[PDB]
Amino acid sequence: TTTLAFKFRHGVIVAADSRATAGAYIASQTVKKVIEINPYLLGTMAGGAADCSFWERLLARQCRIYELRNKERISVAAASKLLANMVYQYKGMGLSMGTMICGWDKRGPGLYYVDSEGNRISGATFSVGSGSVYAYGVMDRGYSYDLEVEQAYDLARRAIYQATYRDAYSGGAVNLYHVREDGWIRVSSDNVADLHEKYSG
Template identity: 75%
Template sequence: SINNTNKMALANVCGFKLGNENSYFGYNNVGQMGIPTLKDALQMSEHFTVPCGADIQASIHKALTDDDSKVKIQFDHGTTTLAFRYQNGVIVAVDSRATAGPSIESQTVKKVIEINPYLLGTMAGGAADCMFWERVLARQCRVYELRNKERISVAAASKLLANIVYDYKGMGLSMGTMIVGWDKKGPGLYYVDSDGERLSGNLFSVGSGSVYAYGILDSTHRWDMSDEEAYNLGKRAIFHATHRDAYSGGVVNLYHMKQTGWEKISQTDVTDIYYQYKAEKDKVKK
């Protein structure tokens, strides 16, 4: 069946032989208990197991880099996401294009994941990886709230995500996300990637178009901007990235993280922004 074929393919890439579906595999150190069978492990939807005695990192690295490998899972990733802090909170701006190599698969991807009313996450890299692990983070944040009767801090949420994905380092995950929120200490902005790296800062841009976005952000960003100036900066940076980067495009989704929680400010097609800026430029020339 197709399901069995998928299991055999996954087992082959991971570097172990699928000879007996009742073979036992232990969990990696992510807090789960029990010893599932391989059949159960490959069907689980909320966590992953690591097979005992198999070097998954080496097997996947060989599958992806060996010229003789028959595994064709090399993906080109393209997007532009950004976030920056200023005096009134944090601005998050993203594009909405999804690509598969040279093909544009969608122009309406939602690249901001609303973890809870006070936390946002962005998507860059593999869409499935970002969506899955940030949903796992959302569940863990909710569990924290129920246990402690208060919201989790932005620092703790980002550290939790970094710790979770670090357990799968070298196993083919592709994720570059920004965790944005507001807690007792005020606005917070962190960058987390699939290697478990975690950075705190005032300004980040992630994706294939980030070099163009940084060109606008670095030259224009100020701490004392007004809300309107901050909104325009976020839109302008994403627009310029989509104008130069073929893997970015669609619409600009703009969010504002405030003390009262996040608010979606606008959703603007980059074509409309282009004609708006063109009209302004032509007006200045006259």
């Protein structure tokens, strides 16, 4: 797995590969690793597939209850905190999860890294999963807060791509999302074999 996200002037970009593995066996090339928590909040999945899916689906349940009870959207901070507090109790029991919670709330674009070790941290950019080291290199050399929208899409797509090239455990397609002030949109799904043809030393 490789996932990434970053905040910039026009919101937050979120991207992921689509491979799943069981040891060295490729179990799928078509996994959706970006989960729709609500129309203005996304979660990303890396680590154990069951663990990520279960806990982020539970997060989605809780956020919706919160909305019904309080008559307003949950903040990115509060949503990331709910998830952190849920998993904290299971530390040391073998859950494997690394997630980015990505939204836009009253404080503007929001991005938090949350994992099964207990970490919860806000930041400008993150990458998570076995391919993250490769994505960081390319994302870091191209990132700017003042990226234009299309340049931001290009960077996210290229960083994931380069991670799928070096990391045996990442591949399939690059799926890209953009969190804007009025909601997230699905931007593109590009097979890595088609991106190979296109790119670009």
